[PDB]
Design goal:
- Helices cover 37% and strands 13% of the residues.
- The chain folds into 4 domains: 125 residues; 150 residues, no CATH class; 122 residues, Nucleotidyltransferase, domain 5 (2-Layer Sandwich), CATH 3.30.420; 90 residues, no CATH class.
- The longest helix is centred in the first third of the chain and has 43 residues.
- It is of the alpha+beta class.
- The protein has 16 helices and 15 strands.
- The strands form 3 sheets. The chain has a 7-stranded antiparallel β-sheet. A 6-stranded mixed β-sheet has the order 8-15-14-9-10-11. It has a two-stranded antiparallel ribbon with strand order 12-13.
- Strand 10 and strand 11 form a beta hairpin.
- The two termini are 27 Å apart.
- The structure holds 3 DNA and RNA strands.
- The PDB classes it as rna binding protein/rna/dna.
- The entry lists the keywords Cas12, RNA BINDING PROTEIN-RNA-DNA complex.
- The assembly is tetrameric.
Length: 559
RNA sequence: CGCUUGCUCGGUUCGCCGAGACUCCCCUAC
DNA sequence: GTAGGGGAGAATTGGCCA
DNA sequence: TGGCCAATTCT
């Protein structure tokens, strides 16, 4: 049963007025402002909003929230339900957290009762309501417009829609194709392929980029080409596939080419289809954010044959693979040892049925290719250069007195703090006290006198280590948050490089995962494969391999 | 067998073309 | 460094003037 | 008849 609806983002070409001025946005803002800021008793009283016109009008009358001329029931229901759920999500968040503590207390009490000890006093339960009766953590207002059926997207038509510079194709007629034969474009016409590049051309079904794609003209260190954004925009607008959404007297027109690319690269619809069924592969309820100007369509339930799963654990893995190997005579495996001199190491195998036995025969062992590892290395050489500067010019923004606790105390870590290298870690060895007591007699500015060990041995002999190093100039953990974490984390989301490097990291991890999946498919000669993972690129690679259960439905075992 | 916008990383003879991602949004905290 | 709450339809029916 | 399109409603 398919239950995944991946997004498909499209751009907005023309509007009437900014979406922040639309009545629907104003009503959403007002309802959110009212509902996030009233007490529990008032929320219980102000909870008769219902799902009907006769209830919506009375709720908007006795409360006093301005309706701004917006009276569509089907769009107001979504707003009100979302606002009340966001109000009642903080309460349940706190509730879950208190249950964590409650359970522990119950287990401790029952264990003490079994052992005869009296139950311990239960810790107070935290609550989201302060002395004023409101929530301490008030949810924020969202800039998101949710469309509904009466405002569903339809193909642009000058006979029923406002005139625009661009024109839309006949909805029934097949959608326009790209360049039929790009090798026939003459010199002096856009898209020309020069003679020398002709032998070097990809033979697979690569996605086709138009000449006006700004990825072909973007600012690069070694281009020396010129970017004229106006010419590219006017060339792109003449071949767009426009769709229109009209809410009340306002409207927006989008470029349906994002939907076309999404349906092409996913192998859902072959070239030559019309706009009517292109819009029919997605829901009629897009989501609009005014800040970007992007509409996030979601694929219709059934367009993508993906059944989302969750990573299994323990015996459930055995049940899952015993179920799988009964479906097909061949089942392929891959074991991931991430963190061995290379980002990924894969152990391929197959799974058979010896009646009720998981018989396995290895078919080899591979590592990631050199080019992919080169890409991963080039990412890290750029990440390190980013957290160099997110600290260098972030800790210098100093209040002239807070340096001692965080910044320069690290300088005295090498300054103020013989047998050992004095920096290389040598645990349990007496090399520290061997040289120290070579010029001293069982005495120093500090001692050990620590009951350390399983039996808490009174280790104080020769004053070995872990006491003098500790009382050497430490971090001291003083005013760490305000002077380090707050400043650095505030500047983390300000630079434009840090918001791109995380996406690049995710893309590279997904590239590694996709390569491993493709290789698995090839080596094991199977189309129903499985992944086992037992648990720096470690965290991101683990998340990327663990996201196949949800995004793509591939089973994943946690070991 | 299969590709018109947008995004990431690269090659260039500056006319393009090689490779990749496609589960995304707000939201309060730490 | 991510943690944990909230989101991401559409078929059938009824009032309805033409 | 018949048509356009809000408003029920379930999930």
């Amino acid at each position: 049963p398919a239950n995944f609806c991946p997004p498909a983002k499209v751009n907005i070409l023309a509007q009437s007025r900014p979406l922040s001025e639309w009545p629907i946005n104003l009503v959403s803002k007002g309802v959110q402002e009212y509902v996030y800021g009233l007490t529990a008793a008032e929320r219980e009283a102000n909870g008769d909003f219902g799902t009907s016109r006769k209830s919506l009008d009375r709720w908007f009358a006795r409360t006093g929230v301005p309706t701004h001329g917006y009276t569509t029931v089907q769009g107001l229901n979504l707003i009100l339900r979302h606002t009340f759920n966001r109000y009642d999500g903080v309460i349940k968040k706190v509730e879950t957290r208190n249950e964590k503590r409650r359970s522990k207390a119950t287990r401790i009490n029952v264990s003490r009762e079994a052992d005869g000890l009296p139950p311990i006093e239960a810790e107070p339960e935290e609550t989201a309501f302060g002395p004023d009766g409101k929530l301490k953590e008030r949810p924020g207002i969202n800039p998101s417009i949710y469309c509904y059926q009466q405002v569903s997207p339809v193909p642009y038509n000058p006979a029923k829609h406002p005139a625009l510079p661009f024109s839309g194709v006949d909805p029934g007629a097949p959608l326009p194709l790209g360049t039929p034969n790009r090798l026939s474009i003459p010199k002096g016409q856009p898209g020309y392929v020069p003679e020398w590049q002709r032998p070097h051309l990809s033979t697979k079904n690569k996605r086709i980029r138009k000449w006006y794609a700004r990825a072909n003209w973007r600012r690069k260190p070694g281009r020396k080409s010129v970017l004229d954004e106006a010419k590219l925009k006017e060339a792109a607008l003449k071949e767009a596939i426009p769709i229109i959404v009209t809410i009340g007297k306002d409207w927006i027109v989008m470029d349906a080419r994002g939907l076309l690319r999404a349906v092409y690269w996913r192998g859902i619809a072959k070239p030559g289809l019309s706009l009517k069924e292109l819009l029919g592969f997605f829901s009629g309820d897009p989501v609009l954010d005014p800040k970007r100007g992007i509409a996030t369509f979601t694929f219709k339930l059934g367009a993508v044959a993906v059944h989302s799963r969750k990573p299994t654990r323990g015996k459930k893995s055995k049940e899952l693979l015993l179920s799988m190997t009964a479906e097909k005579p061949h089942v392929g495996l891959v074991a991931i040892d991430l963190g061995q001199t290379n980002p990924v190491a894969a152990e391929f195998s197959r799974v058979k049925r010896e009646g009720e036995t998981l018989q396995a025969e290895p078919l080899g062992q591979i590592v990631l290719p050199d080019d992919l590892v080169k890409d991963l290395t080039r990412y890290r050489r750029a990440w390190d250069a980013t957290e160099e500067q997110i600290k260098a010019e972030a800790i210098v923004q100093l209040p002239e007195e807070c340096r001692a606790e965080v910044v320069k105390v690290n300088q005295m870590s090498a300054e103020e703090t013989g047998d050992l290298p004095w920096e290389k870690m040598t645990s349990n060895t007496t090399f520290i006290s061997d040289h120290l007591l070579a010029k001293g007699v069982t005495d120093q500015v500090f001692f050990e006198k620590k009951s350390k060990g399983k039996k808490k041995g009174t280790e104080t002999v020769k004053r070995k280590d872990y006491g003098w190093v500790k009382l050497l100039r430490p971090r001291l953990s003083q005013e760490t948050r305000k002077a380090v974490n707050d400043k650095t984390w505030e500047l983390k989301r300000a630079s434009t490089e840090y918001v791109r490097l995380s996406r690049r990291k995710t893309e590279l991890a997904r590239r590694c995962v996709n390569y491993i999946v493709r290789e698995t498919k090839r080596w094991t000669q199977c189309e129903d494969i499985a992944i086992v993972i037992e648990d720096w690129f470690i965290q991101v690679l683990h998340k990327a391999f663990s996201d196949l259960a949800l995004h793509r439905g591939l089973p994943v075992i946690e070991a």
